[PDB]
Write a protein that binds this ligand. Structure first.
Ligand SMILES: COc1cc2c(cc1O)CC[C@@H]1[C@@H]2CC[C@]2(C)[C@@H](OS(N)(=O)=O)CC[C@@H]12
Ligand SMILES: COc1cc2c(cc1O)CC[C@@H]1[C@@H]2CC[C@]2(C)[C@@H](OS(N)(=O)=O)CC[C@@H]12
Ligand SMILES: [Zn+2]
Ligand SMILES: [Zn+2]
Length: 256
C-alpha cells in the first residue's frame, strides 16, 4: 500500500502509477524570477459561508475533513471557469518545522501545507471530475510557525481522538474561512493530485500569504500515526511529495 517511506514513498509511485513522470505533475517549486505576473488574473472567489463540515478522518496518509458538497461552499473566479465545490481539506507536514510543504517558493519549504480540494460541478461527481484536466481546483495554503491560528484549533484538538488509520470523529460546524490568510494573492498552474492516482486533473491555486500556526499546533500534527491501532507504530510525519519538474508550464502570479 502506497505511502511516504523509503519502500513505499514518492520514488516507488511511478510503478503502479506511470503518470508520476507526467507532463503536469504536482507539487512544483515556485521560482519567482520565472513566475509570470498576469494583470488579467481575476481575484479569487472563495464562498465558504455555507460549508457543511461532516467528519474528520485519519486515512493512513493524512487526516482529512469532509464536507457536504451540494451546503454550497464553492471556489470560483481567479483563473477558473464554472463552479468548484469544496469536498474536503487535508494537510501535508514535516518531521521538523523546516520542511513539510509540497509546493516550495524559491526552494523554501514551509512547516506545512493545507489543501482545500474542490471539484468542477459540470462533471456531476468527484469521481468523474478527476478524469478531466479541469476536473479539480485545489487551493494550497502554506503554514509557517508563529502565532496561533484560532480557526485551526478545533482541527488540532480533535487529532488526539483520530490517532491511528481509519479513526474518525464528528466535525460539524467547522468554518473553513478560519484557515485562510488575509491576502488572496495567488500563483496558479495546471497540475496533478500529489498522491496516487496522481491524475493530471488539477488547477492549482497556491496562496502567496502563509497562515501563522503555533508550534503547539503543528506539534499535534506530528502525533498522528500512519498505522492502524494495534499495528507497529509509524508516526505520521513527512507525508509530502517533493517538488516535481515544471516541464515548461507557466506559473502565473496575480501580483508583482
Ligand atoms: C471515485 O469516485 C468518487 C470518490 C469520492 C466521491 C465521489 C466519487 O464519485 C465523494 C467524496 C470523495 C470520494 C473519494 C475520497 C474522498 C476524496 C475523501 O478523501 S480521503 N478521506 O482522503 O480519502 C474525502 C471526500 C472523498
Ligand atoms: C479517484 O478517487 C479517489 C481519490 C482519492 C481518494 C479516494 C478516491 O476514491 C483518497 C485519497 C485522495 C484521492 C484524491 C486526491 C486527494 C484528496 C489528495 O489531494 S491533493 N494532495 O490535493 O492532490 C490527497 C488525498 C487524495
Ligand atoms: Zn491509502
Ligand atoms: Zn494534498
Amino acid at each position: 500500500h502506497w505511502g511516504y517511506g523509503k519502500h513505499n514513498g514518492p520514488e516507488h509511485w511511478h510503478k503502479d502509477f506511470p503518470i508520476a513522470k507526467g507532463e503536469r505533475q504536482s507539487p512544483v517549486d515556485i521560482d519567482t524570477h520565472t513566475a509570470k505576473y498576469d494583470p488579467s488574473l481575476k481575484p479569487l472567489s472563495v464562498s465558504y459561508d455555507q460549508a457543511t463540515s461532516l467528519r474528520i478522518l485519519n486515512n493512513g496518509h493524512a487526516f482529512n475533513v469532509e464536507f457536504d458538497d451540494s451546503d454550497k461552499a464553492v471556489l470560483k473566479g481567479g483563473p477558473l471557469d464554472g463552479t468548484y465545490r469544496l469536498i474536503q481539506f487535508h494537510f501535508h507536514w514535516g518531521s521538523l518545522d523546516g520542511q513539510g510543504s509540497e509546493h516550495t517558493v524559491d526552494k523554501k519549504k514551509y512547516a506545512a501545507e493545507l489543501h482545500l480540494v474542490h471539484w468542477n460541478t459540470k462533471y456531476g461527481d468527484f469521481g468523474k471530475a478527476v478524469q478531466q484536466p479541469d476536473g479539480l481546483a485545489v487551493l494550497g495554503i502554506f503554514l509557517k510557525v508563529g502565532s496561533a491560528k484560532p480557526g485551526l484549533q478545533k482541527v488540532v484538538d480533535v487529532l488526539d481522538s483520530i490517532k491511528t488509520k481509519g479513526k474518525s470523529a464528528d466535525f460539524t460546524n467547522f468554518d473553513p474561512r478560519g484557515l485562510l490568510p488575509e491576502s488572496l494573492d495567488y500563483w496558479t498552474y495546471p497540475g496533478s493530485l500529489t498522491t496516487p492516482p496522481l491524475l493530471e486533473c488539477v488547477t492549482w491555486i497556491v496562496l502567496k500569504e502563509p497562515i501563522s500556526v503555533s508550534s503547539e499546533q503543528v506539534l499535534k500534527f506530528r502525533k498522528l500515526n500512519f498505522n492502524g491501532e494495534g499495528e507497529p507504530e509509524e508516526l505520521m510525519v513527512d507525508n509530502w511529495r517533493p517538488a516535481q519538474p515544471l516541464k515548461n508550464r507557466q506559473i502565473k502570479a496575480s501580483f508583482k
